[PDB]
């Protein structure tokens, strides 16, 4: 049995969902099919380009598990609501408030206006220029965060970015890192 990994981005282009799949195994030089519970369709044929397979269609069922069988090579019984990949947040910004001596971090996500995946949990990771791959992480539920000036190194530059997860009825994967943002701190 050959191994693979899939993820489904829901409520992307309007309501058209996109289920992408790729192989776990390193070398698979073949000179892929997923069926299961759907709506208006019984089984659909993936599109083939390089090593990724997705379809963009509106007739999709969110309820019920589906058997994904590779062509029959390998089968996996997975739920469409347990392989969700949110869209990466965007418009990340940090603003220093001189009066309160703090930094307000703000971002946006197209999922807020989505019907199904509307509850997310975001992870904001920020690091200093000097540190070799050390990140301070903060989990949050809103879209705004406040970092105290006293809890930050003075006269230092910080890079910052954010990820998201379904954290309600839906489960899945973490999104991609948003484009980073950079900000400085006053010199005491």
């Amino acid at each position, epitope marked *: 049995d050959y191994s693979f990994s899939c993820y489904s981005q829901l409520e992307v282009n309007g309501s058209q969902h996109s289920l992408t799949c790729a192989f776990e195994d390193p070398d698979v030089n073949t000179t892929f099919e997923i069926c299961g519970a759907l709506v208006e369709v019984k089984c659909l044929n993936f599109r083939k380009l390089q090593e990724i397979y997705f379809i963009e269609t509106k007739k999709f069922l969110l309820i019920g598990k589906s058997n994904i069988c590779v062509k029959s090579l390998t089968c996996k019984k997975i739920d469409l609501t347990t392989i969700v990949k949110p869209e990466a947040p965007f*418009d990340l910004s940090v*603003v*220093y*408030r*001189e009066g309160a001596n703090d930094f*307000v971090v703000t971002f*946006n996500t197209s999922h807020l206006q989505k019907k199904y995946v509307k509850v997310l949990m975001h992870d904001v990771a920020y690091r200093q220029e000097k540190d070799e791959n050390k990140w301070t992480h903060v989990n949050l539920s809103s879209t705004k965060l406040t970092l105290l000036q006293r809890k930050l190194q003075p006269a230092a530059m910080y890079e910052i970015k954010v990820r998201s997860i379904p954290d309600h009825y839906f489960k899945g994967f973490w999104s991609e890192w948003s484009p980073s943002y950079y900000f*400085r701190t006053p010199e005491i």
Partner: antibody
Amino acid sequence: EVQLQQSGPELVKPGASVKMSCKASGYTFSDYYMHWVKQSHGKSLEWIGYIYPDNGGNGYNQKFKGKATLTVDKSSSTVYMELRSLTSEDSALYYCARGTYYDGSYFDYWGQGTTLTVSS
Amino acid sequence: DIVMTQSHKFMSTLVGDRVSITCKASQDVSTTVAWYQQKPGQSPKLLIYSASYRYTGVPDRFTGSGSGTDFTFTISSVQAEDLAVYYCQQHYSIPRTFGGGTKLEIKR
């Protein structure tokens, strides 16, 4: 003192592309964000996007397909490209501005602006 | 986008008089609002940041107040050279959005 010298006025045909320059001088060019702003006929100010000279950036949804910002530290120049020019990007004066030290939030220095005109 | 709306597009005042331009935000932007001054034939000049903080070299007669959604820029004693369009900009989140502007005419 700080100086942001922008390129001269431009005349372009519809559908063609434009490339404006903004040469900075008088400060450490790599430590400050660089933003672009549009001033339409109605005197309204529309942000365009930001770029950090050490690497890069972009912003604003409305200018995603129109604006393309880049930088060159060697000449300390921020360049700004327009793609599918229309009769709306014309009656606009394009400014380059510098974001303040701690953040690019607000802009403390402005260029003189470039007048763009796209007409057959 | 966060929409900034300036109530009055034109304002007239006498020299030595007070003027207060208002600017309302569609969402809460805390105290992070800046005010720019654009004189005829010139580029915008940053006068105020963070609602009430004056930029370096800005005269003291320019002041600012407000928080959340309502903000007010005030000239305590308008002078002849104060002729300009005054803009409010929320420097709180992305995208950065400006106000419509308010042209300050002088009555004589």
